[PDB]
Amino acid sequence: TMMILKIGGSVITDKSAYRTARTYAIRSIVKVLSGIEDLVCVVHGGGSFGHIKAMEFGLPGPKNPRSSIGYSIVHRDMENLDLMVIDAMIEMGMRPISVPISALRYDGRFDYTPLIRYIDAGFVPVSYGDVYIKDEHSYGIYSGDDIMADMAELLKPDVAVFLTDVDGIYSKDPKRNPDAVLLRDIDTNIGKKFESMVKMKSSVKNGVYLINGNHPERIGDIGKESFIGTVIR
Amino acid sequence: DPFTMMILKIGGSVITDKSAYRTARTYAIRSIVKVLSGIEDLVCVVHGGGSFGHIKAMEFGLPGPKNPRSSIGYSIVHRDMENLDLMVIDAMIEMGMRPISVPISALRYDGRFDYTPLIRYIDAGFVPVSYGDVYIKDEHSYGIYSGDDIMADMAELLKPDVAVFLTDVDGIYSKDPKRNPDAVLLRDIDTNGIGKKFESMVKMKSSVKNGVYLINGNHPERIGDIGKESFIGTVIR
Numbered sequence: 101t102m103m104i105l106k107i108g109g110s111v112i113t114d115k116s117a118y119r120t121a122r123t124y125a126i127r128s129i130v131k132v133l134s135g136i137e138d139l140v141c142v143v144h145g146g147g148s149f150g151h152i153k154a155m156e157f158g159l160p161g162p163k164n165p166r167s168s169i170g171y172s173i174v175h176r177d178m179e180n181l182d183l184m185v186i187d188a189m190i191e192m193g194m195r196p197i198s199v200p201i202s203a204l205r206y207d208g209r210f211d212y213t214p215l216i217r218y219i220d221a222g223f224v225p226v227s228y229g230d231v232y233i234k235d236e237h238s239y240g241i242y243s244g245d246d247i248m249a250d251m252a253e254l255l256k257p258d259v260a261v262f263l264t265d266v267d268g269i270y271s272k273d274p275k276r277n278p279d280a281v282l283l284r285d286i287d288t289n290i291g292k293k294f295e296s297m298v299k300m301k302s303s304v305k306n307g308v309y310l311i312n313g314n315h316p317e318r319i320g321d322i323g324k325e326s327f328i329g330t331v332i333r
Numbered sequence: 334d335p336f337t338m339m340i341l342k343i344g345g346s347v348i349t350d351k352s353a354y355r356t357a358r359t360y361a362i363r364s365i366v367k368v369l370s371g372i373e374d375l376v377c378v379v380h381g382g383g384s385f386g387h388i389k390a391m392e393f394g395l396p397g398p399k400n401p402r403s404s405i406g407y408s409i410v411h412r413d414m415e416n417l418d419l420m421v422i423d424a425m426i427e428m429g430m431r432p433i434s435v436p437i438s439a440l441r442y443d444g445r446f447d448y449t450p451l452i453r454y455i456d457a458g459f460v461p462v463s464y465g466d467v468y469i470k471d472e473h474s475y476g477i478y479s480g481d482d483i484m485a486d487m488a489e490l491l492k493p494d495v496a497v498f499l500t501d502v503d504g505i506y507s508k509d510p511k512r513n514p515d516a517v518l519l520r521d522i523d524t525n526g527i528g529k530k531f532e533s534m535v536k537m538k539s540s541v542k543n544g545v546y547l548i549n550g551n552h553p554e555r556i557g558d559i560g561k562e563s564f565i566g567t568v569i570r
């Protein structure tokens with residue numbers, strides 16, 4: 101009855117302002133996560149601790165002096181964000197342990213052996229969108245969503261949840277066009293995330309959910325008539 | 334020879350305190366890192382966690398059997414070491430270096446750690462940074478792998494020219510310099526309570542070509558004096 105969960109950068113950071121964390125949201129979300137008894141792995145996105153320097157330094161992209169310096173900066177930044185989520189989890193008495201993708205062997209897939217040892221021993225491993233060395237000439241950025249896809253394939257969990265700062269997948273950006281309709285249900289019969297969630301669904305028995313991280317208690321409404329967000333089925 | 338391949342350990346004795354008011358010696362981290370940024374072929378930096386990082390681990394029962402207190406303690410100890418380590422990485426970034434933290438707690442372990450990711454970062458031109466840390470030794474046991482243990486392993490993989498350990502005293506003395514006003518500095522020690530660490534630096538000599546050094550981190554410009562006769566410190570060679 102395992103759950104894997106991603107905390108979206110859009111909801112724990114202000115995506116428009118470099119290194120701006122939203123501490124309340126982090127705490128508010130972690131409080132709900134700590135009550136989830138079968139939560140086995142947490143991932144988080146980077147928002148303003150990721151995307152802004154990545155774009156400025158040429159990540160992902162060819163290796164060169166600027167992108168090599170950017171590699172160290174973006175990872176350091178993502179570590180700083182990660183420690184705020186780790187501190188909140190420790191406060192709620194969880195047993196988190198961060199396992200950064202940057203520290204794993206990569207040979208086209210990442211060697212998640214250390215993360216699986218942590219789950220087996222009863223920890224909740226925490227990982228996050230990160231830089232990695234994709235090949236001799238290229239640095240890549242592996243996103244929180246890519247990590248979720250990988251966990252979904254490896255663990256075959258019962259449920260996978262993504263928290264973002266809107267209520268679900270809509271017909272159109274609910275922030276620009278105030279008309280947009282909520283797709284409360286998508287049948288296997290923002291664009292890249294949607295594509296990853298659909299792909300994942302074939303490994304996730306009981307559905308992949310997008311939920312508003314600003315109302316994290318909605319996670320407890322999964323499977324109930326009061327649920328608000330998107331289920332991919 | 335300014336091009337000597339060096340691995341270096343920044344001792345918890347010099348970048349931490351017993352104070353209840355702060356964790357880290359920020360000035361000491363910065364002046365050391367300033368000297369490090371000028372070393373041509375520094376390929377790996379490791380740092381320690383000091384004594385109350387040691388005491389705090391011991392008070393969780395780490396290293397030791399798995400139980401609730403040790404398991405909670407595992408998460409806290411690792412988080413505290415990561416926070417210390419982020420202060421070193423920050424300084425390294427400000428001084429123009431290309432650091433990448435690679436924690437032992439994230440490495441594959443099967444009886445030995447797989448250091449492939451540190452080795453690949455060195456070949457990619459980064460300076461990996463690691464630190465004494467907790468790990469899962471087996472299903473019922475949590476281990477602690479000290480900064481000195483990491484230095485011994487990286488010496489064996491890398492075969493560097495020199496290995497440098499920074500602490501808060503001028504070098505190896507005949508007696509604890511802090512307890513004995515008549516302690517003599519031993520400047521050159523033929524490799525053929527610092528007892529343990531001194532044993533470990535002698536063992537490392539099979540893997541370090543040109544000497545293992547103990548230098549006061551409060552005066553890190555001494556690092557740049559290696560090989561000179563104005564050098565203050567101890568060499569085991």
Ligand SMILES: Nc1ncnc2c1ncn2[C@@H]1O[C@H](COP(=O)(O)OP(=O)(O)OP(=O)(O)O)[C@@H](O)[C@H]1O
Nearest residue numbers: 344345346381382383500505506507508509526527
């Ligand atoms: N004979 C001796 N010569 C020199 N120092 C000694 C001797 N005996 C004891 N010491 C003490 O050893 C201390 C340094 O060793 P310590 O284990 O603290 O090293 P460290 O690498 O900084 O530790 P860590 O990184 O594990 O925190 C010094 O503070 C000094 O007081």
Ligand SMILES: Nc1ncnc2c1ncn2[C@@H]1O[C@H](COP(=O)(O)OP(=O)(O)O)[C@@H](O)[C@H]1O
Nearest residue numbers: 108109110145264268269270271272273275290
């Ligand atoms: N069709 C859509 N439905 C819902 N949200 C959308 C849509 N198109 C764009 N968005 C935007 O996507 C954002 C969430 O994306 P993003 O920040 O990339 O997710 P994450 O937090 O996982 O990184 C929301 O802020 C929303 O404005």
Ligand SMILES: C=C(C)CCOP(=O)(O)OP(=O)(O)O
Nearest residue numbers: 109145146147150229243244
């Ligand atoms: C390292 C960077 C640039 C962040 C990668 O993470 P994500 O792509 O998962 O972050 P959000 O999408 O959730 O912001």
Ligand SMILES: C=C(C)CCOP(=O)(O)O
Nearest residue numbers: 345381382383387465480
């Ligand atoms: C958390 C701890 C104790 C790491 C151990 O490091 P040392 O300071 O090199 O002995």
